Design an enzyme around this catalytic site. Sequence first.
Site, PDB file in Angstrom:
ATOM      1  N   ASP A 397       0.729  -1.127  -0.133  1.00 28.10           N
ATOM      2  CA  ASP A 397      -0.386  -0.390   0.295  1.00 28.10           C
ATOM      3  C   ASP A 397       0.635   1.070  -0.059  1.00 28.10           C
ATOM      4  OD1 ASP A 397      -1.675   1.704  -0.101  1.00 28.10           O
ATOM      5  OD2 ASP A 397      -2.775   0.843   1.944  1.00 28.10           O
ATOM      6  N   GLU A 400       2.998   7.368  -3.280  1.00 31.67           N
ATOM      7  CA  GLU A 400       2.601   7.848  -3.715  1.00 31.67           C
ATOM      8  C   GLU A 400       3.098   9.246  -3.436  1.00 31.67           C
ATOM      9  N   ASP A 463      -9.891   3.849  -2.579  1.00 35.17           N
ATOM     10  CA  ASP A 463     -10.544   3.996  -1.252  1.00 35.17           C
ATOM     11  C   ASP A 463     -11.931   4.672  -2.538  1.00 35.17           C
ATOM     12  OD1 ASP A 463      -8.342   2.554   0.659  1.00 35.17           O
ATOM     13  OD2 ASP A 463      -8.064   5.381   0.601  1.00 35.17           O
TER      14      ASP A 463
END
Lengths: 753, 758, 238
Positions: A397, A400, A463
């Site tokens: 995850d 970024e 998400d």
Amino acid sequence: NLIQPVQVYEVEQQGNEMVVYAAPRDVRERAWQLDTPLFTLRFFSPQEGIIGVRMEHFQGALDNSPHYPLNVQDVHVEIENTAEFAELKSGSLSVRVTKGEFWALDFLRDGVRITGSQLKNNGYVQDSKTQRNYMFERLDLGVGETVYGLGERFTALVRNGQTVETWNTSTEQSYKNIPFYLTNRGYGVLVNHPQRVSFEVGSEKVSKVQFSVEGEYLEYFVIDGPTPKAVLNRYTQFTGRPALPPAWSFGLWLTTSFTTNYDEATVNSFIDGMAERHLPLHVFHFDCFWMKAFQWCDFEWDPLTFPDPEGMIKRLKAKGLKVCVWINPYIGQRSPVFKELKEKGYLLKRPDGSLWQWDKWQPGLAIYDFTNPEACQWYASKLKGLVAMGVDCFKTDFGERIPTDVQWFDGSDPQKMHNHYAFIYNELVWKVLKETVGEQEAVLFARSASVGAQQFPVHWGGDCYANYESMAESLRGGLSIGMSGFGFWSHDIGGFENTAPAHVYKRWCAFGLLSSHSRLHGSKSYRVPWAYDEESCDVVRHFTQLKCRMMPYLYRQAALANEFGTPMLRAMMLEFPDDPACDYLDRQYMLGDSVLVAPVFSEAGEVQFYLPEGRWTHLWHNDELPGSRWHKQRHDALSLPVYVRDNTLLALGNNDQKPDYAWHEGTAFQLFQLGDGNETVCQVPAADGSAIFTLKAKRQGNTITVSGEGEARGWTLCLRNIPQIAGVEGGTQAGSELGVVVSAQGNALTISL
Amino acid sequence: NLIQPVQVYEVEQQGNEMVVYAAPRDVRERAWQLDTPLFTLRFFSPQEGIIGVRMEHFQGALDNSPHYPLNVQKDVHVEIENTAEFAELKSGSLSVRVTKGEFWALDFLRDGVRITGSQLKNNGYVQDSKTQRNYMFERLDLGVGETVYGLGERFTALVRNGQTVETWNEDGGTSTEQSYKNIPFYLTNRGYGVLVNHPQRVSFEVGSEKVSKVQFSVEGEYLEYFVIDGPTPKAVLNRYTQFTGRPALPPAWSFGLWLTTSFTTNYDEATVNSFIDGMAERHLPLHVFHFDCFWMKAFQWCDFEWDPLTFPDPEGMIKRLKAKGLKVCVWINPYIGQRSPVFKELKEKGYLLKRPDGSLWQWDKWQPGLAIYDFTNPEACQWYASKLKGLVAMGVDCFKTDFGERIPTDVQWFDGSDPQKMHNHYAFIYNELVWKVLKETVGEQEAVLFARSASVGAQQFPVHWGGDCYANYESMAESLRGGLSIGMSGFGFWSHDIGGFENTAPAHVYKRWCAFGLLSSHSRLHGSKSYRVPWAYDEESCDVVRHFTQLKCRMMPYLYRQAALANEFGTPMLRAMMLEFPDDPACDYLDRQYMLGDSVLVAPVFSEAGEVQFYLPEGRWTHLWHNDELPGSRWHKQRHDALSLPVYVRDNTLLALGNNDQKPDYAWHEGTAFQLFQLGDGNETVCQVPAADGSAIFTLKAKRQGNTITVSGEGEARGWTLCLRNIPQIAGVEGGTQAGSELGVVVSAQGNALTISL
Amino acid sequence: NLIQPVQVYEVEQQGNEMVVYAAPRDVRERAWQLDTPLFTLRFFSPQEGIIGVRMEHFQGALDNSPHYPLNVQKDVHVEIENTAEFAELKSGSLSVRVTKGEFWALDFLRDGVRITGSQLKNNGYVQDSKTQRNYMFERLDLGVGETVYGLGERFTALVRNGQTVETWNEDGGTSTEQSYKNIPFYLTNRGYGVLVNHPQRVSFEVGSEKVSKVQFSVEGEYLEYFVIDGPTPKAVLN
């Protein structure tokens, strides 16, 4: 101030490359051959059908790492320097500069122009306000020409009219930015710049795709087709082929949710609830709170919640499940490991020597500096230690929000590292997996990506919200990421934010289990089917059984994704590039070569979908529909539009409990609308992705000859919508609701009728 | 700083309006009922089916003129229900519902079903401390498959989903994000529209910032926007045009072919008559001639003074032109160059826009020392109108209102208008002045313009023109997109420069563009640096121009009925496919084809080779003069020569063609050529032939039952015929005579009642 | 922008030291246990009767020499009490108590009786976006009749209550707020003192900004100060 090429001054052949010196003014006379800039355009070919263009102003600029992982080659090119033009040809693709008074840049396919740069549509800009320099290009868009891709974007599928920025579910921003776009005219473009690339797709100049970058040079590649699929094939050869995920990864994944309370007891409760309800489950994922709060990601199990990690994992593996855990490239200040990392210098530092930190996601968050080799080895050691307890794969995850006001260990340019960090991080985790479980068993669940990250599947939508709008957004993003070079894509079934209404959850189950990779994950509410309704359990069971039954076909399509870069979840334009009705289709998709799926986005079950040319047949309802038109239908919670195209030989399996089984034993072949004089082929894959058995079916009048080659046993063939036949030689026949079932006694049968 | 309504504190009914006081925090306890902002949301209804929402923070701010010319009613019948769970205001089928309690939510409902709304924390007030400026923003939801259209004359992709749009008039052209006619109104394929009631800059993020929302924001302390119900896009445009202004009915002659002198070419009376005589000798009908900029001395535009060395006798020239049966148009604009002798006079009189310090505002774009006529000064308006009336008196019939978009804001208007709003409202003021002059001189029925700029309410002054396009197929498609968008933005009539404006067009581009332009509401041949006369390209170009001018004149009964429809219901003559077939999922993204009225589908050709792909909705479609039939609900691919393109009539249609192919303004009810297309069993179709004033002068009904078609006429007509198309022979006809033709059986009626067997 | 400790999240005992992780928001539930700053308060005892408090935001900052020459011991006998309601560190008669539960509160006690302390939302971290600078500040209470003395050779009124002091050597003289000898240590008639352990500029508002508190602030990411027990001023100086 604006400086643009207006005239060709010189053309030189340097080996297999063609350099054009162009002036921003008339320079045929000596008196004007001074006090002027001179653009240098280098045309080359790193691969057949791909032409690279490097337009530079000042060569004295610094051009530091990182760079995109491109497979740059001795490619056969043909250079022609005449008095009227200069042309460089790689295969069918060519670039032509028009000499004389009129400057012009054209890209030709077999002599016919597909795009190009017109006069005064590219060049160099000096903003004295910001004191910054940019290089820009504008490639033409013809009438009816549509643009797709540019990463996983959740905006409209067709990019025409959009502003895009290559800088890493309900916003313009993107987790996976790729400066590559594709066109319905059978070509693509890759802007070869890891830093921020600014695309105006029909936005500033409505008939052009404009792309600009900061600095003194702009490098971009035009990739020919002539079909979008061929474009993706060359692009994935150039930047990296999607890896073939293991078969077990294609099953159903279940997570503990994010901020919900879970312990070993909760894990066992979910597993036993799935098992007693006859709900096959294949992968279990541990989310953030397997580590203590505020300490992510220090790789330490929470003792008061998971006192016995290795033993729990051992028991989970004894039940045949695979285990995934959550990780990310950040570390919280609370962790006792934070001191170790700071003293050893494994964390990203500011130029002054201090650590880079902020209080988002974690208090005093720090970033693992993966340009430090010893930090990489430390991270990999922790990952391997987790694998030692039985972990099979990892969810990578984040990755970024990379700062730029920093200094990396190796001196990398921060503006480019901002995007290439996703690649570096996923590549380390992928190397760890290859070294521990093996290259065949390597799989990820990654949210960030850069050019070349398709080599590390799988990738995850992010998400999303729990409503039909976010479901449609997710589908759009998956189509875009597929057309941006990634073959495998997943999304959170049922949504991520907020609890979904029962109907939304059931429709999302239908959609997710008809995707390459299916996971039940949420933020503040559980995603077990019975947390919504009992009919939700029914839906999950039905479609998990369906996917396990389709795996013989789905894994062959995944092998195709690995071999040609063709995504499993294809946009309609990709499969039917010549059909004008598929250009703007984002609510439906092709799951492989043969299956068209149209998720339901309505509480009432209403759905409208377009069918291209042919006679389409539903995968299990068996009703037939004419093609080249739209259709309206209503389906219950256990159904949706799933139609197989004509002249198709599809391979289903005899196991609906696990996805990884011997697909070539007891194979259920299904024949769909085989026309007179047509031939169809079906390749059943092995575990390693290669073809283990090939079945061909030839129709001649009223006689269908079917021949098998390879290793198979106990397979059958279902003549669909053929209630009775006139005869069968080589095997026995029986009746069924879906058509005539022939049980073969060899690899050669002859069906009369 | 971001301040958003999070909970309803109070709801009060003030007459027919509903006021909601909402707080950005929990205020159910007294301790929290202070030291907090308070949003005031007024919900009202200015017209049945329209709900206005006024979201305010500080009422002490200045709210100065101008404001949009909205026909706001204060006595509309509404139903207000203030319960413990919600508060709802209903106008007709449309309703606005505020959810009370802990979860704030605003919903717009059609007959109880939600069509859109603002979710919690999707609107409010923002304070940018960088620029020290305050904004109010709103975000209305977009459903699955929901597409957005309109927002003025924009040349980007027709469907707005994913675009940033800014309502700020700018002179970019046909190939850029900028637009000459910005209107803060958008429309949806779900049958509702939204008008942001702010003449100043409105910033729209259409599925761009929030991909599932249309966000719009404005500067200040209040945001006013109207939700307009349908339930169909046509009904939405009807309500919107009633609310902001109905398109005027242009005169019939205005629908003919226009020819201009081009821009920077040399022209005088000799050249004008030379081109007109060349048109006549080539049998090319011409109906309107336009004098462009250089009818005034260079650098002196727009002083309204004829150049003596080029037009020594203007009035005599105009009368000779009118003696040729032509109508006359001239170019004007709201600017004046310093070179003109009138500049000093206007400066001394104070008719030019001034800076706050008293000096004149000027720049060197378009003209040296250019100044702007201050139309907030009544005396400047009367001066401009006097010049306009003087020119109309010498024979001018209409005006080309060019420019009027780059209006500066660092100025002070004579009446104190807010410059930020005047930037856009100036187009309306200027075009309205010219339109009133025309109403006073030539008459309201004979009034028509050729306008390049427009604001909310400017649709009342047709016609409108695309602008400075280029001569290639891509720019032709851009022009078509802009026309469709402005049609869906409240404008019924739209024109564009056939052949392009910049650069000379290749012959094939010119021929295709002629076909496209003559199948538009208004058709003009105009260029910048090259002539647009047909014979400057080819002989086949002359044939193409003749063919399509004759065609347009023959269709005038139908086209003028459709123009009457545009005037009555705000339905544009150039309709997007989604507008006519809002329930067909195949029409959402169709911009390369259009519906020319209710019955005709046109698909221009954008290929040198003649290739064209087009979608036909359900039915059996028939070509207007080739007569071939095609099944509907699917795409078709064809190749056409320079004299052809896809022009297909829908089934169950009774279309009225005319018997005059030389002029557009003739007695359409005499010699009417009726055409029957695919009349199904048990169906009836109606055809209304218009009068000169747009009213129906003759109505013809045709009912098919088995093998009997009963045709009944009501009104005034003479010598009309009816063509049973693709019916070679019949079993007899009572009430008229029969004859054969290439297109089918032609019945010549002798009364208003015929009965066809077979 | 101001970030203050409002609730205790965790208390850990590291040998003879007590670490308190406190959040500027409610963190009793898992959904809010991320995307938040976290103050780290290390309580220790370098010498019997002296309790040091290190209030920190970011550990990644540079902490370069010089430092004050402090005789800091690491093996002083301390008693640490970690309950469900509070956490306490005791050196001799002095103790420091953080109140767990919903509302944060810090108290300094002499044999169980409060002598001073920081109330809720009276310390924390400040970010000046104009000057682009970060500060840490603390406010210790002043009781009724409590007077402050010391802070170097200052020529203002002997009792400091109501004075602004800055620990920055200057060549002013005998008639100005400036001082040749600046010491960030103050003393109280209640038998305790406080030493702010920062050689750089320390800003003291002694009953000036908050009339009932002694406020001291420093630039950077951490604030370290020592509370010195008495029970008499002479013992404090000893």
